[PDB]
């Protein structure tokens, strides 16, 4: 839950997709980072605040971004200046979500209890109540400052509250041009606390002394340029309007307001160790809309990194591409769709659907749709979750095709040793995952493109152990689909229906015949010395072993030769001539294998001898058993295995 921050974000995205009212994609971002910083502060250890401080700041930024995207878009045709409205959006997040010390404890009853008659600790208790009131007013606590000013006998501060309440009645209107020049002159008079000296300059739009700013934090530090522009833009337009008159004016005001970049050149220069933090500098880029300019700049200095930034920049583009179509750079979009799917490795199991909302071109083309062919191995949970998100047809025909064609180039080293052994454990451990993508795509129409993948690996077996026999067992783990591919094949029209349905049916008969010979050869070899002294059951079983084999040989010779001779698709004939030429000698030795173990019973001698001696004699009428010796090299092997019967049968 709390640990899976990415999962929470994904859920919010999913809800929006179901609905497809558009301002709800970013509002859910305020419920994630909040519960996280709350789960490390409600109960638990106190040292977790070293990580909760990162969550205590990533949530206030999502609040400031929600007011900027709705002002420049949701312009309803209801019943002027569009750039001055940004100052109001900056004041809402700069006033509501600010730090405020609570009310002071042990407030004195009467005044001057220790009594130039007051001690040094009396102006401090007066400045303590002065700072408690100088802070609440800066955060918009009129409702609280108005009661706070009346409560502490602090009547010296109430005279300006209504002056602000009179300035608030003039701001809602959108004379007082002379009242702005008196407080600035009051800020140049001596005799004021440091907290009250900064309060008079902040309301008008002036700069106070630097000794009061030293205490001021570099984050808060930004309200100085915000209040000056307001005091100057209203005096400019106010000046333009001139609704006070020249006489009402007293002193010249800096009515030349600067831009955002000239103000940011000074806030990150007063307290740069914290004003340029990676979670606070993102608010200037929302006014510039440059997405891949802050993350792709941390991949070059590899000689000398922050996961919270990659999750927000990538989540911004899915909204930036949606808020304004193509607002995110097209290069940045595909660079964000690729950096997200790659960084989402520890959490790639559930986000296999959230990457489709911004398909764009990385998904329509074989770009962002080929990475799923690298993790879908054994677990059946991720294979079924991708079935949602409204994706099928060609995407299913492009993920299954990219799953079997992308591993065919890696088996190129498996066709070089045509006369030696090799390391086939990886092929016997990675090709098993190469059959779950097609077995999961239970489509009777997309069966022709995958039914040939097993026959394409018969030549990688070569001598010694064969990989097709183990591959024949993977197909037995999911048969019956032959009935689904034969019924769905009569649904779509096809012209060459006299050769496409005959190759699939003949390959299934040879493979099932091959899987049967492998299991028949595993039961006679596992016999060894079975039945012990009671060979009566073996006298009939070995009789069945010797009959089922003498029949299997004549049957396997007729299945491979059933391909006739002259055919146009001779590429399928030159590949099956070796597999047929490789299943011949292994049968004659099994009857002879009853002359090493069943030789303790002089019964397989007169039988297994002539049974294998004529196996080459009748293998001379059907075109001399073709030339299985010409396709494998096993000629003298047959000459010696049978020649040995002249020192045992006599």
């Amino acid at each position: 839950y709390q640990t899976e921050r990415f999962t929470k974000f994904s859920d919010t995205l999913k809800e929006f997709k179901i609905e497809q009212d558009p301002f709800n994609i970013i509002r859910e971002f305020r419920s994630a980072a909040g519960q996280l910083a709350l789960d490390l502060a409600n109960s638990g250890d106190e040292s977790n605040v070293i990580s909760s401080k990162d969550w205590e700041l990533e949530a206030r930024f999502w609040h400031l971004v929600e007011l900027l995207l709705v002002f420049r878009n949701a312009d309803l045709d209801l019943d002027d200046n569009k750039q001055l409205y940004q100052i109001w959006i900056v004041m809402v997040w700069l006033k509501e979500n600010t730090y405020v010390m609570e009310r002071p404890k042990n407030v004195p009853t009467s005044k001057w209890l220790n009594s130039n008659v007051l001690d040094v600790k009396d102006k401090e208790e007066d400045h303590i109540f002065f700072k408690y009131i100088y802070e609440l007013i800066l955060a918009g606590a009129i409702d609280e400052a108005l009661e706070e000013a009346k409560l502490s006998d602090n009547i010296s501060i109430c005279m300006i509250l209504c002056g602000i309440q009179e300035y608030l009645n003039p701001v809602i209107d959108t004379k007082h041009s002379l009242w702005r020049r008196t407080v600035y002159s009051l800020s140049q008079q001596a005799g004021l606390d440091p907290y009250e000296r900064a309060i008079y300059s902040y309301l008008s739009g002036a700069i106070p002394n630097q000794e009061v700013l030293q205490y001021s934090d570099w984050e808060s530090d930004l309200h100085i340029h915000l209040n000056q522009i307001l005091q100057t833009e209203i005096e400019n337009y106010l000046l333009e309007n001139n609704q006070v008159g020249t006489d009402e004016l007293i002193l010249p005001l800096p009515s030349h307001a600067l831009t955002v970049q000239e103000v940011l050149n000074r806030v990150a220069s007063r307290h740069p160790s914290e004003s340029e933090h990676p979670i606070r500098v993102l608010m200037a880029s929302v006014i510039l809309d440059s997405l891949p300019s802050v993350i792709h700049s941390s991949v070059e200095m590899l000689l000398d990194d922050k996961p919270y930034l990659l999750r927000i920049v990538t989540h911004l583009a899915i909204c930036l591409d949606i808020i304004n179509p193509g607002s995110v750079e097209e290069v940045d979009k595909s660079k964000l769709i690729t950096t997200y799917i790659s960084l989402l490795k520890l959490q790639g199991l559930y986000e296999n659907i959230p990457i489709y909302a911004t398909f764009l071109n990385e998904s329509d083309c074989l770009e962002a749709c080929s990475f799923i062919l690298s993790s879908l191995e054994d677990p059946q949970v991720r294979k079924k979750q991708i079935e949602t998100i409204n994706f099928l047809r060609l995407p299913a025909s492009n993920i299954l095709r990219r799953t079997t064609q992308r591993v065919f180039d890696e088996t190129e080293q498996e066709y070089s040793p045509s006369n030696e052994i090799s390391i086939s454990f990886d092929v016997n451990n990675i090709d098993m995952h190469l059959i779950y993508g097609v077995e999961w795509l239970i489509e009777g129409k997309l069966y022709v493109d995958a039914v040939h993948s097993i026959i394409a690996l018969s030549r990688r077996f070569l001598l010694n152990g064969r990989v097709k026999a183990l591959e024949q067992f993977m197909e037995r783990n999911n048969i019956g689909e032959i009935c689904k591919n034969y019924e769905l094949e009569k649904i779509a029209d096809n012209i060459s229906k006299d050769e496409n349905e005959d190759q699939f049916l003949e390959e299934i008969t040879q493979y099932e015949h091959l899987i049967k010979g492998i299991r028949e050869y595993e039961e006679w070899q596992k016999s060894v010395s079975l039945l012990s002294s009671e060979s009566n059951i073996p006298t009939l079983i070995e009789k069945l072993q010797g009959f089922s084999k003498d029949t299997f040989e004549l049957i396997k010779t007729f299945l491979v030769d059933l391909t006739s001779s002259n055919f146009a698709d001779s590429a399928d004939y030159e590949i099956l001539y070796e597999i047929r030429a490789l299943y011949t000698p292994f049968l004659l030795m099994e009857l002879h294998k009853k002359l090493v173990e069943a030789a303790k019973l002089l019964k397989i001698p007169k039988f297994i001898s002539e049974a294998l001696a004529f196996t080459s004699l009748v293998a001379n009428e059907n075109d001399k058993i073709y030339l299985l010796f010409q396709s494998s090299g096993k000629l003298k092997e047959y000459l010696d295995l049978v020649a040995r019967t002249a020192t045992l049968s006599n």
Epitope: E96, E102, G140, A141, D143
Partner: nanobody
Amino acid sequence: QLQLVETGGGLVQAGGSLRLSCVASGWFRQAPGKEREFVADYADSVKGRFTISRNNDKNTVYLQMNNLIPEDTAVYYCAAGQGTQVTVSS
């Protein structure tokens, strides 16, 4: 430390009334599963039935919810809050 103390929520029937008071120790709604939407300016789903409690200067101007329906069962938060549950049974 904007101790925003909210109270007044509860469980009512379809058609009842409630009065949510919010005292800023120093009105948006969230349904179960959806995103935080603004209630009180008045939302189109509560215009004519609710009365917001926003006041100028130091004036809470606390006001309620009349003719409550099952579409208003959610957690209400205050903004200028921890949350107060207001459920309405059908």
